[PDB]
From TrEMBL, chain B:
<dbReference type="GO" id="GO:0008483">
    <property type="term" value="F:transaminase activity"/>
</dbReference>
<dbReference type="InterPro" id="IPR036633">
    <property type="entry name" value="Prn/Lys/Arg_de-COase_C_sf"/>
</dbReference>
<feature type="domain" description="Orn/Lys/Arg decarboxylases family 1 pyridoxal-P attachment site">
    <location>
        <begin position="328"/>
        <end position="504"/>
    </location>
</feature>
<dbReference type="InterPro" id="IPR050881">
    <property type="entry name" value="LL-DAP_aminotransferase"/>
</dbReference>
<dbReference type="InterPro" id="IPR000310">
    <property type="entry name" value="Orn/Lys/Arg_deCO2ase_major_dom"/>
</dbReference>
<keyword id="KW-0808">Transferase</keyword>
<dbReference type="InterPro" id="IPR015424">
    <property type="entry name" value="PyrdxlP-dep_Trfase"/>
</dbReference>
<keyword id="KW-0032">Aminotransferase</keyword>
<dbReference type="Pfam" id="PF01276">
    <property type="entry name" value="OKR_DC_1"/>
</dbReference>
From TrEMBL, chain C:
<protein>
    <submittedName>
        <fullName>Probable amino acid decarboxylase</fullName>
    </submittedName>
</protein>
<feature type="domain" description="Orn/Lys/Arg decarboxylases family 1 pyridoxal-P attachment site">
    <location>
        <begin position="181"/>
        <end position="368"/>
    </location>
</feature>
<keyword id="KW-0808">Transferase</keyword>
<feature type="domain" description="Orn/Lys/Arg decarboxylases family 1 pyridoxal-P attachment site">
    <location>
        <begin position="1"/>
        <end position="140"/>
    </location>
</feature>
<keyword id="KW-0032">Aminotransferase</keyword>
<dbReference type="GO" id="GO:0008483">
    <property type="term" value="F:transaminase activity"/>
</dbReference>
Amino acid sequence: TYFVTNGTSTANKIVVQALTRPGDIVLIDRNCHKSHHYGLVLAGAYPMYLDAYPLPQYAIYGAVPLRTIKQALLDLEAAGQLHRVRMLLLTNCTFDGVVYNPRRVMEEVLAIKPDICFLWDEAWYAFATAVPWARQRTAMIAAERLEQMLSTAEYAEEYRNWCASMDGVDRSEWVDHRLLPDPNRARVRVYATHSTHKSLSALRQASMIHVRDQDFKALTRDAFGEAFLTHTSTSPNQQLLASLDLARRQVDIEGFELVRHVYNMALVFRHRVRKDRLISKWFRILDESDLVPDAFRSSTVSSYRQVRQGALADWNEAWRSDQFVLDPTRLTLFIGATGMNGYDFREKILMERFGIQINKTSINSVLLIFTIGVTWSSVHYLLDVLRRVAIDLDRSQKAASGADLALHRRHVEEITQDLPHLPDFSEFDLAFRPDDASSFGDMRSAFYAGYEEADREYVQIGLAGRRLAEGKTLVSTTFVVPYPPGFPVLVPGQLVSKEIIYFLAQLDVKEIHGYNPDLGLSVFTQAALARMEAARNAVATVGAA
Amino acid sequence: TRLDTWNLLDDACRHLAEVDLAGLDTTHDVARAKRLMDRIGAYERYWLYPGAQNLATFRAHLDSHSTVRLTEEVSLAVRLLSEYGDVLLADDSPATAPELLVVASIEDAITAVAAIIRHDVTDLHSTVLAGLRNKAAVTWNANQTYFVTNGTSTANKIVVQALTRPGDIVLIDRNCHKSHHYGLVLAGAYPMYLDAYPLPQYAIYGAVPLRTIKQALLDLEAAGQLHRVRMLLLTNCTFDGVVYNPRRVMEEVLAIKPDICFLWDEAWYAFATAVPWARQRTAMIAAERLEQMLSTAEYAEEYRNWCASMDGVDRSEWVDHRLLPDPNRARVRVYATHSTHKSLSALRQASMIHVRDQDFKALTRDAFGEAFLTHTSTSPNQQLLASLDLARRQVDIEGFELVRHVYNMALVFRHRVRKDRLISKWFRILDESDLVPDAFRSDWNEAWRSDQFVLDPTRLTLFIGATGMNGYDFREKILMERFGIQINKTSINSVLLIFTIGVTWSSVHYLLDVLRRVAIDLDRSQKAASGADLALHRRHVEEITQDLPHLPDFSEFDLAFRPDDASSFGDMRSAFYAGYEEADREYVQIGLAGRRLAEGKTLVSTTFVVPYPPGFPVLVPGQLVSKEIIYFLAQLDVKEIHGYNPDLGLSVFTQAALARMEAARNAV
Amino acid sequence: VTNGTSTANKIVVQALTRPGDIVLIDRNCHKSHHYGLVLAGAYPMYLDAYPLPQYAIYGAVPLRTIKQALLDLEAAGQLHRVRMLLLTNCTFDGVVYNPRRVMEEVLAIKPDICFLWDEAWYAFATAVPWARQRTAMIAAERLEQMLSTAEYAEEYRNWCASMDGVDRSEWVDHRLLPDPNRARVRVYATHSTHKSLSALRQASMIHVRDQDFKALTRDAFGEAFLTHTSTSPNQQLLASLDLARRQVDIEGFELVRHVYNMALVFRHRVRKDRLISKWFRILDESDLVPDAFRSSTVQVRQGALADWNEAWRSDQFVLDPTRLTLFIGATGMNGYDFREKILMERFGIQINKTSINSVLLIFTIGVTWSSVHYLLDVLRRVAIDLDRSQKAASGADLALHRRHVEEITQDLPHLPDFSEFDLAFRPDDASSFGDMRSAFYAGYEEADREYVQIGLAGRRLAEGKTLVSTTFVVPYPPGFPVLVPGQLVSKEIIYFLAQLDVKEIHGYNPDLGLSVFTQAALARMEAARNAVATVGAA
């Protein structure tokens, strides 16, 4: 552990620079916070974007299924490119609150690429110290358990029997099998970068780069220190920051009381929002049955008849063994029954800043982030707000009898019953793909090539569809980061596939980052793309002449 | 995992059709679907609900390339498996199903589905999983309550200091929380210890029978020192779980000393709130009813009749007769202390003190406030009240019906232990009749209030004597090393199960599973045992179960410490602090103690000996060591005793110091 | 320690002291300290701070006094009893003791005493340069290093030669060096880790620097730690936690430093602002420490590094830069009123104390450039309105203003110094320590207690029927116990008590009277004590 004074994105830039050099491929969860993509522009690495499983009924994105990661690695393996792959950047505890199972992810990824490094952005997973079984899903504990496992002889026997079980299966088919990391080759090179409690507060100061690296002392110590000083300062006291604080920093004992208080407040809120029948009539709190498709979990509520309430901890195996679970301190609230949009609800109904937060407003839901300021007063206030909303909705239902029942039904069906498509990642343009078969992009070159004011042009969203049908393909020159998704839907050099233009065309918000409806979507001119493709062909020739 | 493989096959059979409607080469999806069905079929024979005939039928759809049928079929099958995926019997029957299912496979037993087996039928259908079918904040309990910022130890010290002055005599339960003994050390009060009734069958103390309280009061009255006493400190409930009837003690004691204060340490009796009859046995409710009773004229007439009967009865005779407090003379002065909402992993302890004293406002209110300053410390300008409000809010999370829910689980667990008939063979839970003597034991609810003693349902003593091994051996070898159960006490032939709010259904079921599996190990050892091994098991049972040393009753305070020779109350404070002088105390080994006694040299303990840190002291400062106590110390397995260590002898006052302090007190 | 600071004091006191020990405790210390002394039977010898009548506040206790009291017990032959010197490293007003000197000279007299320092007020000493030296653990480190050196053994040899032939009674007039062989540094300290007030006000730590801890006190310390805080499965915190090189808080270093540079900016602006400084002043070592205790003699805010360092190294008393006493006497307005009305809205600065003519500004981690600018704005508005009303003054308004200034500046009342314990409770009639515990418990005997009106009490003293208080009396303005159980209510204490119109004083009520001992009860208790002192000695 190393204390970084300058926030989480600085820690990410430090570790990315310590681990990656230009032209390395990194696998990156596409929906991660935009600051991760700029770091890959800066490092000059090529992203291979992994696309999360969609939840269109909420217009939410989940995590990246581990089969997606295995397929994406084996695609490059068939291309012969896999040697390039240097990193697997994933965000643990994604903003939506889906939580990865890092132990299995590392096991199966290290089955394919025995020397990959893992970076986990854990800035959202702050309260895992409170929750009794959440700690094991932290990267730094999963890496410990995996390194212990890789050490034992019993595991060497288990792997012997596993590779005997797989014997005669093609490497291409390992996407369909449960893999184990070869204890001879796999090496645990895990990194995690979590925000401090002070940073959790709206002012952002400080972070910590946790390290569980087998090959730090040999391969990366120098690069890591160099990048540390590069991204902070080259002044006295930076070296002191470079000093470790792993067996130190026990001051959290006072902190532990606070994180456990916050967790107990989250439990109280969940139980009083589920029991209270005024609130429960309309409001709901999504759980693993709603936000995680059944394909990614073995725990099924209906299949075991001796059911238990579940307020109590009768589901300890889910944490240990499922792919995806929800962080209990990041509570999604479903307002679909009410009929109000999430943005409308957050902005008007409550405006609650005393404790808790609503960082994200979904089309039919509002996410509730329990911070370190929450108190009994704050949760009782929020519950009272919910209760008053429910009472006035019941009043409107009573009035609804006189021809307003159809308006309530219309609002509810429109927000919940009817949903738009979620646009998954297109592909990089040929101009910016170094290998014509693979999907990783030269996104840095597209970023810089996008500033050539003679190579860019503007197209209106109403014309883009016909331009695409005309074969005048569209390639974006810049990032585009709409507010509701909160992540880049387009990146430099990405093809604006029909689904993505259809997505952008719906947005009323004019102040989208990277795009402007009054000017148009910035795209490469056709001649510029032809020139870029010719340059790529020249490179692919001289590199093999 | 079987579900994972079926979901992968569902994905393959979906994409097969998604390609087929496009007209590209489906051969890849056909090959994938065939490989996936081949993988699934290695074990699908063992699960009834999806079936193996259905697997083969989907294979037949695959090779007939009827893609659009296969997609919908598999996506129905996998969703059915996801939501239902069928109680399941695990061997066949020819009977025409006279819920129930059958699978022909027996040995593999992979389904793990309440499974049953048949030979090479209601006796098996009668298997059942039933029973598992389930200020605005004040406790409403008393006229005053004061939330302490520290654990009950400190609420007890606060009340003791508030009411007790140096040179008072306090009647004190021998077996009470060590914090009370230290409170008496601080106050400079003289304890007079009431020994509880023994249970030699189990090597546990029960409770103080009311006759002992009356006898102690009358003994002090005969010595003429009764006026000095002003506190009957008795725990309500016990670690054992025997429950005092507070009203009976309060009335029959106020007959003799109509101005004594009562302190009831209720810390253990957390679950009294859960059930109403238990609520009646709580001290505060009893105090309110007693106060109401005294005021009424009708009670006064009842008292007049009792007094008429009492006339012609000497004071010594009173102990035999029931007594009723005089209405005019008696003052209710009842104090209680309760621990609040303790977390499984909390660094903070919170308590409350419940006061129902008529004289409190004038006699002790100032002292009570100063005691709070002396312990909690309050603030220069009081902000403690802000933290008092906070404590109530913490209760609100606790009050999710969790206490009742745990109480129901405890009853279910007891029922399961009796009901199974496999657990019953080697394990039972002690009945109220077992843990209460017939003399002290009398609608069930009426009987419960009427009885002098009852059992708290949530503190179940598991009896293990049929296992022939100690409670320490059982606890360590079976529970701790296997699962995390809430046991803490370990008796010679039993262990105590405490159903705190931290207990959850999964913990109950794992405890039941552990008991069942040990009953299987013992059944197989029984069938396997030779006559010699069975005789050895009989020896193990007879030793622990039958041959037990009687408990060490309190002996006396030394003549160095009793203020007068005609009574057993002692200057425990003086002994405690005098025991700090290292030149005045010597270490005598437990094996040497008996020789010292045989040599005619007395032994006196310098310090508390407390085998369970929150439990009760076996020895107290200034108490004479006696043979039974030596045996009790020797035979206990636990080496965690506070104020002692097995590496060292008992710290004993030296004969020169004993003679000095004896002669010094003779002048008073 | 997961409980407020007073619990840490309880733990260390119970771990080091036994009933009938003498504890040299400063009287100015907060009531919670004295109550702890009542517990455990300790006999306190009260040390009296040097007065500051012109502000009606008390400073530290001069080392002169500490040495004299220890020597006085030495002449009585009682010194063997002394087991502790309870002091507060930072006074509420701000006066910072120089611990290394207070421990060198004290260990010269009593080579094996234990020191307890309440440091709860000295929170920001780790921000201020040259402040950490005056803590108890750094003073203990430096003193232990010194005692180890051979060079110090030579210095001590020469010092003994200097004192050779001086009578040991005259040691109070000469500095003293602790004999290296006998001197045993056994320092303790306690503070609060930024505890939240009102709610969860439990943060505390016990700092231990004790050469004999492992041998003489480990067991007693652990037992006291469990007694005060309930025994629990989480017993790791008491035994072997040893977090000396742990709980690094780099962010907390940035927060204490932000708050210190905030105090610096406030203290500079309040001096350079031409409106504010006309009516307001912040007190300084020149004003709050009598020059007898500052060897250094004739800008501190600007520069001052390596020049004013000497004051920290060698002085007896200095001001904590964050405990800013704002003098308001030139405003002609009493502190209680100024705080109550002008500062009613309040802010992060605590302003939690109000003397007659001054208010104490206590900076806390909740401070920002906007709390500093708010307080400066308030000051400047008060100054502007005072200028306005001064310019509007007629000669009669000038007389009014000047007398409002005079009454809070010139004739301020005498501060009541500690009266000696009553004879009934002094175990040794030659010495002024008292059995304050037995006076506390003997005070609850409703037949031995009596009430006398403050006006009557002076008459009673004239008559000759001596007055002895049964209880603590803790008036709000000084904020410490002016009377304790068994203390003689000397004439000056009666006169002081008579001025206070606040009915709500702790331990006293003017509608009811001083809770004093009856004369016959005192005679009986004296006779009992003389009987004990006879049977205990022949």
